[PDB]
C-alpha cells in the first residue's frame, strides 16, 4: 500500500509538496517515482529516485521538480515549484523497476555471433562481418501504484460543506440521503453508520455549480447517519437522517 499525503488545494505560484510512504512495507530498498494525471489528459511522468539516492526527472519539467528522500529512505517527497492551474492533477506515488543492462548490438540486418562475450553477421553496408557495440538497455516500468492525491491549484479558498439530510415526502423501499453542499476543494468521503452499511449505498460524483463550489449526494435504499469527511478543511460531520413523521 502506497499513500500520498499533502494539501489538496494550493494557491498559484506557490510550491506544492507531497510525501509518499508505504504501509505494510518500506520504500528504503525500492526505487520510488511520481506520476500525475490532469483531468481529461494523459499520464505524465515526473521523476524518480533510485535505491542509490540519485534522482531523475522529466526533462521538460526538471527546473520545477525536486524529489528527495530522508535518511532512512522510508518516505519520499515531491516538490513542484511555481505552480499554475495546469499543475492541477491527481498525483500518484509508484515503485519503479529500473535496470540498466549492457548488451551487444548490431546494425540493421545484422545479428550477433553465437556465445559472444563479439562480432555481427549479416548483409549490408558494413560488409558480411562487423564488430558489435556495447549499448545500454533501459528497463523501466511502474510496479506498485498509490491511490493518488487530487491537488487543485486555484485562487479560490477552502470552503467547508453544509450537510443536509435527504428524505422523501408523504413504501416498498425507503430511500434516505445526504446532500454535501457547497464545498471546496475535492474530494469528500461519505460513509454510512461508520461503515457498517456494506450494500445499498450509492454516492454520486460531484457537480460543479455555476457558483463554483462542488456538491454531491449519497443515498441509501433501505436510525441512519451519513459520515461526511472533508479532510481539506478538517471537517467531519455525522448527520442523522430521519424520514418525515407526517
Amino acid at each position: 500500500q502506497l499513500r500520498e499525503s499533502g494539501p489538496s488545494l494550493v494557491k498559484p505560484s506557490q510550491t506544492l509538496s507531497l510525501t509518499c510512504t508505504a504501509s505494510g512495507f518500506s520504500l528504503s530498498d525500492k526505487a520510488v517515482g511520481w506520476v500525475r494525471q490532469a483531468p481529461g489528459k494523459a499520464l505524465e511522468w515526473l521523476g524518480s529516485i533510485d535505491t542509490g539516492g540519485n534522482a531523475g526527472y522529466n526533462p521538460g519539467l526538471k527546473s520545477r521538480l525536486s524529489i528527495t528522500q530522508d535518511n532512512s529512505k522510508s518516505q519520499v517527497s515531491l516538490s513542484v515549484s511555481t505552480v499554475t492551474t495546469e499543475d492541477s492533477a491527481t498525483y500518484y506515488c509508484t515503485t519503479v523497476h529500473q535496470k540498466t543492462r549492457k548488451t551487444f548490438s548490431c546494425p540493421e540486418g545484422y545479428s550477433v555471433g553465437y556465445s559472444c562475450g563479439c562480432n555481427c553477421h549479416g548483409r549490408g553496408v558494413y560488409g558480411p562481418i562487423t564488430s558489435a557495440s556495447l549499448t545500454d538497455n533501459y528497463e523501466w516500468y511502474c510496479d506498485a501504484w498509490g491511490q493518488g492525491l487530487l491537488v487543485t491549484v486555484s485562487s479560490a479558498s477552502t470552503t467547508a460543506p453544509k450537510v443536509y439530510p435527504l428524505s422523501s415526502c408523504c413504501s416498498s423501499t425507503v430511500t434516505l440521503g445526504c446532500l454535501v453542499s457547497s464545498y471546496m476543494p475535492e474530494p469528500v468521503t461519505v460513509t454510512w453508520n461508520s461503515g457498517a452499511l456494506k450494500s445499498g449505498v450509492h454516492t454520486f460524483p460531484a457537480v460543479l455549480q455555476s457558483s463554483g463550489l462542488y456538491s454531491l449526494s449519497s443515498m441509501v435504499t433501505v436510525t441512519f447517519t451519513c459520515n461526511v469527511a472533508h479532510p481539506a478543511s478538517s471537517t467531519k460531520v455525522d448527520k442523522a437522517v430521519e424520514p418525515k413523521s407526517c
Binding site: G56, Y141, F204
Partner: protein, 214 residues
C-alpha cells in the same frame, strides 16, 4: 513527448480488440514497452512490462506485442470489467526518463439495457431555514450511459439554475448521474409541483415532489 494511441476503442463482449502504441526509435523501438489500466475508483494497475510479460494476477486474455516502433495491447475476449482507460509507456534515453501514451478509452458493447431508477429529494428543513432550496434528482442503474434530464414546475420547463453531471459507471457496471435545481426558499414554496423527467432510450421516468406535502 507522447506515444500515440487511438482516442477510443470499441468492441462487444467476447470479441478481440487491439490498442496500438506508436512511438519512435528512441522509446518504443528499444523494446521495453509497459501497459497500464486505469479504472475509476481504483488505483492504476500495471498490466504488461517488457513488451510481452504480464504482471502478477493479470488474466491471460491480455497480451502484448511490438512491431518496430508500434506496440500493441490485445484483449482476446472482452469482458465488461475491462472497460477502462489504457496507457502504454516506455523509457527514453535513460531508466529515469519515461513517456506515456495519450490514452485509449475502451468501451465494451452488448451489455443488457436497463431503464434508469429515479429518486427526487425535496429541500431539507435545515436548508430552507437558510432561505435556500435545492432539489436533488438521483439517477442510477441505467445502460447505456446516456440520459436526458428535464426539470418542470407546474407544467413549465425550467432551464435556469439546473446543473447535471455526466454519466459515470457504477460498481455493478451500469451508469449513474445526478441533477440539481438550486432555488430560493420563496421559489420552492410558490409552485405546487416540481418534476424531474429522465429520458433514456426513448423512455421517460418522471418523479414529482409537491411542496404542499413535503
Amino acid at each position: 513527448a507522447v506515444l500515440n494511441q487511438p482516442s477510443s476503442v470499441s468492441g462487444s463482449l467476447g470479441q478481440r480488440v487491439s490498442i496500438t502504441c506508436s512511438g519512435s526509435s528512441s522509446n518504443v523501438g528499444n523494446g521495453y514497452v509497459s501497459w497500464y489500466q486505469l479504472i475509476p475508483g481504483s488505483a492504476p494497475r500495471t498490466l504488461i512490462y517488457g513488451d510481452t510479460s504480464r504482471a502478477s494476477g493479470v488474466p491471460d486474455r491480455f497480451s502484448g506485442s511490438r512491431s518496430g516502433n508500434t506496440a500493441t495491447l490485445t484483449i482476446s475476449s472482452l469482458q465488461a470489467e475491462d472497460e477502462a482507460d489504457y496507457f502504454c509507456a516506455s523509457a527514453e534515453d535513460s531508466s529515469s526518463n519515461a513517456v506515456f501514451g495519450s490514452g485509449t478509452t475502451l468501451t465494451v458493447l452488448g451489455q443488457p439495457k436497463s431503464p434508469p431508477s429515479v429518486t427526487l429529494f425535496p429541500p431539507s428543513t435545515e436548508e430552507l431555514n437558510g432561505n435556500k432550496a435545492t432539489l436533488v434528482c438521483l439517477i442510477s442503474d441505467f445502460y447505456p450511459g446516456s440520459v436526458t434530464v428535464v426539470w418542470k414546475a407546474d407544467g413549465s420547463t425550467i432551464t435556469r439554475n439546473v446543473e447535471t453531471t455526466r454519466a459515470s459507471k457504477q460498481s455493478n457496471s451500469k451508469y449513474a448521474a445526478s441533477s440539481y435545481l438550486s432555488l430560493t426558499s420563496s421559489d420552492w414554496k410558490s409552485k405546487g409541483s416540481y418534476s424531474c423527467e429522465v429520458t433514456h432510450e426513448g423512455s421517460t421516468v418522471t418523479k414529482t415532489v409537491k411542496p404542499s406535502e413535503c
